[PDB]
Every structure is written in structure tokens, then in C-alpha cells.
Assembly symmetry: C6
Homo-oligomer: 222 residues x 6
């Protein structure tokens, strides 16, 4: 797949690089939306982990809720030692999680981390729609200027309803991935869809995946 306009970097997540016809568009952001426990955080961690392990590309993980400590503990579920990557300066977890007890400043923290750690991959996890739209638009634009390739996760509450919470997120993003966890006849089945990738082709519709001891495994069928 060399005849496409947009250079892509490989997630090395089994099956995803096939669905995306080469990986995530470089220097752009990809929205990854899903209901609770669909694998958003896992996808964003796996993106960073693979970048470090496979290509020695440093990553920055920005967390807004889960603590770094819990992110690290949970990744051990997959045999990933993120503490060691942090110790080696290859992974930086930026803690923006609220005190257990603005955006401008946040963006500067991110930029600082990206420069300090030489980061090539970024993951960001995770009331007026128009305000959300402009703020997200601003975040996306700043990351692009910096040159980062970014996964940003968002929540949604229905498997076949709005893409994210505010009805605007999918429109200001260059790339949109939807993780679903569909309940039918009392069974759950996980799927991944690439809804859009601006300027390039991709496989369409839903593709099954599982979450196992090895992380996400996606199965393309086309």
C-alpha cells in the first residue's frame, strides 16, 4: 500500500495496521471512542509501548483520571513493565489526574514533555458542544504543529449512537476509531471500526477483536 497520500506509523497492534492500511497517520490525531471497558486505555498504552519496544520511539501518556500508579499496575496484566520504561526515560506519564483532596497550561506541559523525552507518540486518555469543539480543535492543532502522532480517547454511552459525548469530536478529528462491546442474546462481542481517515483509504465496517494476556488482538477479514 504505497499509493496513498498520508504517511503512517505502525501501531504493531495485531490486525490494526491492516485495517488502517498501514497504521496511524503521522503528525495527526486519531480519536478512539468507546463505551466503558471497551479497551480505550489499552489501545493507547499499546500504541506507546510498541513504539518504544519496536522502534525506540519515546512516548508520552497523558492521564486525566487514572493515576500513573494504576496505569502501571494494570499494564502488568499484559506482561508490560511500564515502570522500567519510565525509569529509562523512554516513557513519560504526565499526571493531569485531579487532586483526590487551563487547557493552555496543559498544552504547554505536554509540549515540554514531548521535547524533553524526544517523544514521537502521544496518547491522551481521556458543557457547550461549541466550546468542546473549539477546545478540542485547538488541542489537535497544537499537537499537529509540534509534529506528534496522537491517540486521544473519548467516552460514549451507546454502542450504536453518537460517536462521542458532545456530537462534535468526530468532526474536528482527522481520524476516528470506534471500539464497541456489543451485547446481543446475553453475549458480548468486541469490535473495532475505523470510521474515517482523512486523505487515505482504510478497511470499512466492524472487525472483531479480543483482549487477552497479550493485549488487543484484532482480526481483519478482507
Amino acid at each position: 500500500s504505497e499509493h496513498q497520500a498520508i504517511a503512517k506509523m505502525r501501531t504493531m497492534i495485531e490486525g490494526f495496521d491492516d485495517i488502517s492500511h498501514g497504521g496511524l497517520p503521522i503528525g495527526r490525531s486519531t480519536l478512539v471512542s468507546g463505551t466503558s471497558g471497551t479497551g480505550k486505555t489499552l489501545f493507547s498504552i499499546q500504541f506507546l509501548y510498541n513504539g518504544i519496544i519496536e522502534f525506540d520511539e519515546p512516548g508520552v501518556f497523558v492521564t486525566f483520571e487514572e493515576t500513573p500508579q494504576d496505569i502501571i499496575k494494570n499494564a502488568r496484566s499484559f506482561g508490560w513493565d511500564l515502570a522500567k520504561l519510565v525509569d529509562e526515560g523512554k516513557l513519560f506519564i504526565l499526571d493531569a489526574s485531579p487532586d483526590p483532596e487551563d487547557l493552555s497550561a496543559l498544552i504547554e506541559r505536554i509540549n515540554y514533555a514531548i521535547q524533553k523525552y524526544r517523544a514521537r507518540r502521544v496518547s491522551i486518555d481521556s458543557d457547550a458542544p461549541s466550546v468542546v469543539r473549539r477546545e478540542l480543535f485547538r488541542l489537535v492543532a497544537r499537537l499537529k504543529q509540534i509534529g506528534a502522532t496522537t491517540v486521544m480517547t473519548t467516552e460514549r454511552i451507546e454502542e450504536y449512537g453518537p460517536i462521542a459525548r458532545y456530537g462534535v469530536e468526530e468532526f474536528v478529528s482527522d481520524n476516528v476509531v470506534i471500539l464497541r462491546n456489543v451485547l446481543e442474546g446475553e453475549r458480548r462481542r468486541r469490535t473495532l471500526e475505523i470510521l474515517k481517515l482523512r486523505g487515505t483509504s482504510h478497511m470499512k465496517g466492524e472487525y472483531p477483536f479480543t483482549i487477552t494476556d497479550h493485549g488487543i488482538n484484532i482480526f481483519p477479514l478482507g
Copy 2:
């Protein structure tokens, strides 16, 4: 990887691949009469009986006397467990005559140390406020090291996980109890929707409530 403690609730430790994640909170959501209080009581009762692990039950609606009375239908002598100092029922109900999260936490905390409890149950208007408040309760409980069941309400069997559409997102673990109409009959089911950082069986599993509490069939 995260360790789990056995609930000894029949069938549940299979569905959860070992029980509830230790040192974390598990959200248990369901419409009215789905078995939420029962699940949270059975969690502490089995902790005491099977493992000599004391428990703290935090009630916001039902009086301790009613919690005790309602458990007799299952042959659980909760009055005896309270008399022995193995179960503490913390009453946080608003007295019909005459909210601060930080006070509750300290009371829970001292109860935990006083009774040397390993297991806690908590039973049970801006979504953004709810989200932040729940996030703080979960964090503070985690800081104490308590393994906690916390129940919440929902109003549809196949709609939102909880009431404000945010509860499942700040919870580490989520269990849904349903009570579904099948023709004119009801069918109860239990689902483990998610457990962060660990594995579990997927989808719904039928259960019944009997004289011995919750009985699940994987």
C-alpha cells in the same frame, strides 16, 4: 497483575476469575429489587464466615435493624456477627428530623481500623459533580486499602450502566444486575462489564435469589 479476593458467592468467583480485585472498588448497579443490597451483604457475610475477615457495611437508607431483619430470610444471623464485633453496620442514613464526603471517609476509616476490616460495602445532581465526587470516594477508599462493593441505581435494564451516565467511567470495576421481563415472567442476570487490569467472563449469567442468597449459574 492485580490479585483478587474470593466472594464465595456461588458462581461469581468463576465469572470474575478469582473474585473482586483487592484494594479496589467494584460498582454494582441495578434497577429496583435486583439484589444489590443482597450482593453487598453476602460479600461481607462470606468474608466473615469463610475467611474470618471482618466487614463494614455503610448504609445510607435502610436502618441497621432493617438490614439485620432482611438478612434473616437467608439464615444469616447478622445480629450475632455484630454482637461478636465481626460485622459493623455504619449508619449514614439521614434522620427524618433535622453532603460532606470527607467526614464519611474518616468514619469509614476508623471503623476499618477499629474492626480490622478487610471488606467494605457502601449501599448506596450535575453528572460532572457526581463524576468528581465519586472519583474522590474511590480514590480515598483505595488509599485506605479497603476492598469495596458500592451499589448504585439504574432505571432501565438495557440502558445506561448507572443513573448519571458517568459512574462506570470513574469506577475500576463494574457489575450489572438485571431483572428482565421474559413474556410475563422475570429473569435475573449478572454481568461483569469490566475489571481494569484483569480478566473476567463476558456477557450475562442467570441467577436466582433463594433462601441461601444469590445463586449464579455460569
Copy 3:
């Protein structure tokens, strides 16, 4: 294991495995004309006639006179029970208001030595708060209470404000379901805290003798 009082409403004590738990409140919710008031009235009437248990009926909209006139069609003479001091109808109907209501209810309960209470018919937090306090106080008093509420759909929320079923000990749902062009009445005990009951919907009719439920 918990003591129940018999409603003597045909079929209902079978569905509730012996009647309504004594000293607790039971929510009875339904759309319009589902039989809520009838259930409430029958609960008190049977208590008086069969068990000499006095009752207090609390009405918020229907006048005492219409309550009495409507019951008359079931052959139930409520005016006579009121005359004998076995029934008190408390008129709360229009031209903490709650605390004033509670005190009035308490007084009637003490005065008439009532064992049974029926209460016939905005922000969720406020509703939940007020209702919880009403229920808690009746419990302290030791009343066994039927509390009716409205709902607007047969298979939607239990009651109007989405909280009523969560603060009640017991929940009964009266439905009047349209199937094709025919109506079918059903009763369901959704929940009885601390005890067993039959599950799901059971058909009933309303006749000259009141509610008649068939649980088999």
C-alpha cells in the same frame, strides 16, 4: 420469617407469599385507572371487616365524599365504618407541608388505633428526600402502609420521578396494557425487601367485588 398482614385481596396474598410485611410501606404504582385507589381502599376495608384492624385513608385530590360514593358500587359502606370510628378519611385535598401531613397522619393513627394506612397519590432529589422521610416516620410509628403513585407508561419508569421505587420497601406495579385493541390488567410484585414473593405479571380483573387476581 418476617410477619405479613393479609390484604384479603383475592390472589394478592398468594403473590406476596402471605401478604404485606407488617410495619413497612408498599408502593403501588400505575397509569390512570389501573386500580390504585381500589387496591388502597380494599386494603383498609378488609382489615376492618375481617380483622377489626382500623384504618386511615389519606386523600390528596379525590374528596372523601367521592371516595365513599365510588366504594359504594362495590357494596362497601365506608360511611358506616367512619361512623363507627373504624375508618378515618384524612382529607388533604385542595380548595414542610410534609411535616404537617406526617403529624396529622400520626394523630389519626393514634386516635383511631389504626394498623393500616393508605396514602393515595418537583426535583428528583427533593421528591426522594421527602418520600424517604415519610416512609421512615411511618415505619417508626409501626404503620403498615400502602402508598399509591402515578406513572405515565406501562413499561417505563416505575413512578413519575424515577426515585420512588428505590426508597420503598415494597413495590407493586399495576399495568393496563393495550394489546392490539384489547386492554389487559396485570399486577406485579417487583420487590419485597427481606422476603420471597411470586415474580412477574399476573392478570386481574376489576368487578363488583373489587380486585380479583389470578396467580395460577
Copy 4:
């Protein structure tokens, strides 16, 4: 066993469905979507009282003018103008020019003036609508009027009326439907509720023809 007395509408089929007609001294809510026959039912009620039983009636209108009411009733061969001339029908015009306490006095005055037994009324907090409609029902009750009051609704199988409260404050509720299925319309009438008395249940098909409403109980 003392029955609720009823007065016959002589609307064909309806006195079978209602087991004798409308409850005397009370108000019956007649609700439906646009063009379901609400006004027709309310007029046929008054017209039949006058012609069959020599019971005069008051028609209270809030939007259609008297002249249009009269004009439209000509469709069915009824001469309302003549009945107004004879003092047997009074159309009370409460329609706006291109409050409730005042209206009630107006209606009471008209009832007393014309020996009227039958009244038809044709036709934003839900809480205030509820309390206001309640008062209207109550004062009509004291006068001893037997009243048809129409309301609008916007869905064939949605709320009984517009504000989700009107059915709960009415003693009696009739629903007129105009159901669209597979490009064809079907008129049905349902008596949902009559407090204190019996009635047939569910929907009964009807047509509107040159003779007004014809209901088919079989």
C-alpha cells in the same frame, strides 16, 4: 351495591360501551389528536340531550366561533341555530378576539338561565394545569353539571393528553384515536376509566358520517 347513575348520550354504540352513558354530575375528559371527532362528540352529546330528553345544554367554546360551530354542525343535518333560538341551547363564546374564576361564573349563570343539565367545554407547568383543571372539575361538580371536556393530544399511543396530568384529575376519560397503519386510517374510541363504575375495555372502531358518530361495540 349502589351504582353510579349515568345519563345516556344516545350516541350510537357509546351507551353500550359505557354501560349506560356518562356518569351524572361529573366531568368526562374526551381526548384525541387533530380531527378525531372531539367537537362532534361534545355537540352530539348536547344535541341528543335536547332532542331526545328535552335536556338543554351549554356549549362553551374557546377557539371556534359560535357561527362556525353552527355551520359545521349542518354537515350532520343538525340545526343548532334553531335550538339557540328556542333557548334550548346556549353557545357560550369564550373565544379570543383577533380568568378561570370569571369563566366559571359565566358558565354557572348560563346553566341557571337555561335549565341546563348538560355542558360541553371545547377545549406551561404541568403542576399548574393539574391544579387548575382540578378546580374546574370541582366547581362544575358542585353546580351538578354533567360535562364533556375535550383535550388535545399529539400522539395516538402517547400521553392521554398534552401535559401528562389531565387524565389523573378527571373522574372519567375517553380517548378518540385516528390510527394510521399502512397508509390507511382507523377511528377508534376507548373508555379508559370511569371512577366508581363499570365499562367495556379497549378500543372500539367508529366512523363519522352524515349522522355523526357511529360506534361499533361488536
Copy 5:
């Protein structure tokens, strides 16, 4: 002395309505986008002029007269000629790229000026909308106009019009639908209600042709 009807001469419609539109009254014609509302209102005036020499007033609130005229040439109708002959007046109430009373006075003036028998009107609180519409309807009735007034709706099988009140202050209601099923569109017309008179019930299929609306028998 039941209410009489004026023929629309719209193929199929006068059968459905058992004679046409009730004279001296207003008929609501509601529909989703591109359902044929303007076409119906224009064809009503056009046929009145061509068949009965009854002059018409068309009141436009968005579309310019120029575009109304231009679009009607799709059907082989020369509205510019009819305006020039004084048979039709297109009253421009469209805004430059609200007082209902003033509008009503302009419509009355036009009806008197052109001796019009036929009028088409194309096209925040419901209580306000209800009151204003009722006023407009009442005033057109006192004038003696037979009126078609179009309204928008956003669902094919949802409310009649946008505010949930328009169908209740209208004497007459026609619904145009453009139903999408299995990737194909089907146009239908329904007479929902005609106060004080009879009409056929349910949906009737129609097409928009080079010569305007054609309505066919059920099915």
C-alpha cells in the same frame, strides 16, 4: 347549508376532498423539505386563474418572487405573465439579505386590489404561535379568502407541524409526505381533517410531474 368547496383542479385532489377546498377557510399543507408544499400552493392559484378567472395572491416569506416565477417555469407555467395581467400578485414578505398585524393589512390590501378569491401563504413559544396563527386564520376568514398555508415538519410520521399547535387552530389539514423506505422515496398526500365536511381518509400516492402534482388511487 353545509360548507361548500372550491375546485383546485389538481388532478386527483378534488376527488379525495369530495369537491375541493372548503370556501372561505384556510387549509394547512404541512410537509418535510421538498415535499411539494410550494407547488401545491402555486397550482391552487394557477388553476383558479386559468380555469375560473379567479385572481390569486401568493405570499412568500423566504423565496423571492423571481425565484418563484423561475421555478414555476419547470411546469410550463408563466407566472410573470399572470402577474403582468393583474391576475396574480406575488406579495414579497421575504427578508432583506415581526408584526403580524401589518402583514395582515398588506394581504387585505392585495386581496382588495386584485379582487382575489384565492390566497396562498408560504410559509418561540407554541402558545404565542398558536395565538398568532389563530389571529391570521380568523382575519382571512372575515375577509372571505380561501387560503392555502404551508408549514414545515421534520419527520414523516411525527407531529403535523413544527410547534405542535398548528393543526389544532386550522380548520383543514393536508399532510404531504416523502417517505424513504428501502432506499426508495414515495410521495403521499393525506387529507387529515376538514371541519364540517367529508373527505377520503389515509395516504394517497402522488407524483410531481412536468405539469405539476398528480394524485392517484390508494395503493
Copy 6:
């Protein structure tokens, strides 16, 4: 004039058949769709074909995507827009947000570009409904005065719900096209529908299409 409205060919395969000749001249066509339905692609292909096939210059007005991304992404369809910009055949007007709105002023700037580049085709890409309606009405009217033939895209959130976002856009527009991206049985199917063209005829309902290395391809029948 005395003729029914004339149309300009889009040369988008299959579309000029569906529209019986192309887009109505001197008017605006709304093109609405959920995310990634091909709205920007449709609006670019309209300008691109105008330039290449008829030497009709074009103005593209972008409200969020930067000109440089518009140009970069169009390379996916084999089009060199930078070359067209260099030759003065295409002008991309950047109305996108400074990362850290007066439609009347914007309209005048669109007019400058239209007059400067002698453009015949315009594409515009892409919360009180009364306010939306009035502003959209004024934009449509001013474009019609200028005489431009315009594609304007809008967003929608459901495949079979509202045409656009505010329930008014499809009513003030002369022409409406809906792009859908329907998910059934885990597969997506793209369709195009011409819902309405005031004053002229068109085929009805949905027609399937794909996006290829040569742009939009609407299947026959």
C-alpha cells in the same frame, strides 16, 4: 430568463445522471452527512472538475481544515491543487480558527476572491435555530446575487434522522444532497441522495457509491 433553471455539470461519475444535468446554476446546494461521508471530497471534486474540464475557476472556503491539509488530502484522489492555486485557477480561502463569527464580512471576502479569480464555482466547507436560519438565508441570497454556483457542506449526526444539525438548513436551501454511510451487519454502505432541487427534476432515493483513488464513484442504477 424564460427558461426553466439550467444546470452545470459536476462530471462526478453518475451524479449528472441522478441530477438530470448537474447542479442548478447560480444556486447553492446543501451537501449533508455524518462524519467521513465524503462531504469535503464532493465539494473539492466539484471545483476540480470545473477547472480541469471547463476551465471554470473555483473558490474553496474552509472553516476548520487548513488549506495545507485540504491540499495534502486531495493528493489521495490524484489531484494537485497547489498547482491549480499556483496557476490562479483555484483559490482556497482560509476562514479556519486561530487555535488561540461575522458572516457579513466573510461574504465580502468571498466576493473579492470570486471577482479576483473570476470564479464560477464555489464550495464552502462547512446555536439558535432562528439565528442559524436567518444567517444561512442571508449567505445563500448573497451568493445568488453574486451569481455563483455553490456547494455548501453541513454536518448531521444520524444516518436516517434530521437532514442537518438545526432542523432549518434544508428548508432555506434551494437544493439538498444527503450523503449517508450506513452500518448494517457490521458493514458500511455509502449512499448519495438528491432530496430536492427547487424548480427542476432529479432521480429519487438513495444511490450507492464508493470513494476511490479517482474520487466519488456513484454506481449506475
